[PDB]
């Protein structure tokens, strides 16, 4: 009924990695192409997502064991999971009070209608919002939020990964940390671990729907030209 030295180190590493790659001031948003409220929100949200991918990559590189993987496995894990990590880390700015994502000022407050003006439909956005409120209602500790992100990223069951056994062993270590953390440090958390694993399963369904809608978007050059080179690379279909 106690966390080990190695488990505590892993938590401290992941929390620090998250603080180093998540800006609570949202001060970089003013450097994106501005919001316009045709797909009027596509430039701004493309820039937001591009920025997010960079942060997700920076977080990944500080996950214990991630940098020891092959470059090909690191890419394979990021290409498959980046959209899910973005959905997870967007939960911090999500607000139950008006079902929107508030990133600083009123200009960087996004509702469902804003994302439809970037090319997405309710078939993605309705489950996405229901995902966000259910995740928000979990009231995760920071430690649990960063562990769930790292567990999602280190999933061996993605297309293109080669060292399934090494990646699974890393993910297993993180799950054991999460389970022990909820046991010792999260009061009334009897069913919390199972609820978090279920959230990882919801994310695969969101991933699938977003990929469908991203393909439809990015096959039209008048829209793909509004994306960034990083978005095109990471969400694209090239294989190593």
């Amino acid at each position: 009924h106690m966390l080990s030295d190695e488990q505590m180190q892993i938590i401290n590493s992941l929390v620090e990695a998250h603080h180093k790659t998540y800006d609570d001031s949202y001060s970089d948003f003013v450097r994106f192409r501005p919001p316009v409220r045709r797909l009027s929100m596509l430039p701004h949200l493309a820039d937001l997502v591009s920025y997010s991918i960079q942060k997700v990559i920076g977080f990944a590189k500080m996950i214990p064991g991630f940098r020891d993987l092959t470059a090909e496995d690191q890419i394979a894990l990021l290409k498959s999971s980046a959209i899910e990590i973005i959905m997870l880390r967007s939960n911090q700015s999500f607000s139950l009070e008006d079902m929107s994502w508030s990133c600083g000022g009123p200009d960087f407050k996004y509702c469902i209608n804003d994302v439809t003006k970037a090319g997405h439909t309710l078939e993605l956005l309705e489950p996405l919002v229901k995902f966000q409120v259910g995740l928000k209602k979990l009231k995760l500790h920071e430690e649990e939020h960063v562990l769930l992100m790292a567990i999602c990223l280190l999933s061996p069951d993605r297309p293109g990964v080669q060292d399934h056994v090494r990646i699974e062993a890393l993910q297993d270590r993180l799950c054991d940390v999460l389970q022990a953390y909820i046991r010792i440090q999260h009061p009334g958390g009897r069913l919390l671990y199972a609820k978090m694993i279920q959230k990882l399963a919801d994310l695969r369904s969101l991933n699938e729907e977003h990929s469908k809608q991203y393909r439809s978007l990015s096959f039209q050059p008048e829209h793909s030209m509004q994306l960034t080179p990083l978005v095109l690379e990471v969400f694209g279909s090239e294989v190593s």
Binding site: Q54, I57, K61, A71, I75, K79, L230, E233, V234, S240
Partner: peptide, 11 residues
């Protein structure tokens, strides 16, 4: 291929 990812993954 993956020009930007490879770069960003270096340090």
């Amino acid at each position: 291929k993956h020009k930007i990812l490879h770069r960003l993954l270096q340090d």
